[PDB]
């Protein structure tokens, strides 16, 4: 059933048609941008993970 | 890190030969200059104290 | 007079009830986040100390 499991991947990704699996482990996950804020009793911090 | 007039260490009046050829680079962030030109305006703002 | 002493430090800073002391020589500050914006004749320059 193609339309049901085609449904499950997120909507920003869209795969192309061949893959070259050229091994028996292939790790798969995204690279997101993480914008924290900081705050208690002694101050503020703010950071970002790139 | 702040500059005050009581370190030239001279109560009194005088006149200052600033040397502009021998402007070392100690701490430099992408707005630091060498070369200034004209009327300098610096607009500096302070957050996330701790 | 405590009520009086007490209202002198920081709003941000709220200290907890210890500290061991073990040196004749404490620096107490701030680690504060500088973004500074510089204009002239030449042209404009904008940086960010963290």
Not at chain 1, 2 to 14: D, G, M, R
Not at chain 1, 40 to 45: I, K, L, N, Y
Not at chain 2, 16 to 22: A, E, G, H
Request: hydrophobic residues 30%.
């Amino acid at each position: 059933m193609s339309s049901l499991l085609n449904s499950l991947l997120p909507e920003y990704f869209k795969p192309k048609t061949n893959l070259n699996i050229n091994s028996s482990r292939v790790q798969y996950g995204f690279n997101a941008r993480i914008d924290m804020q900081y705050e208690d009793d002694s101050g503020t911090r703010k950071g970002s993970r790139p | 890190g702040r500059f005050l007039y009581t370190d030239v260490k001279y109560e009194g009046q005088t006149a200052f030969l600033v040397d502009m050829d021998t402007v070392k680079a100690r701490d430099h962030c992408w707005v630091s200059i060498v070369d200034p030109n004209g009327t300098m305006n610096l607009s500096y703002k302070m957050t996330n104290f701790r």
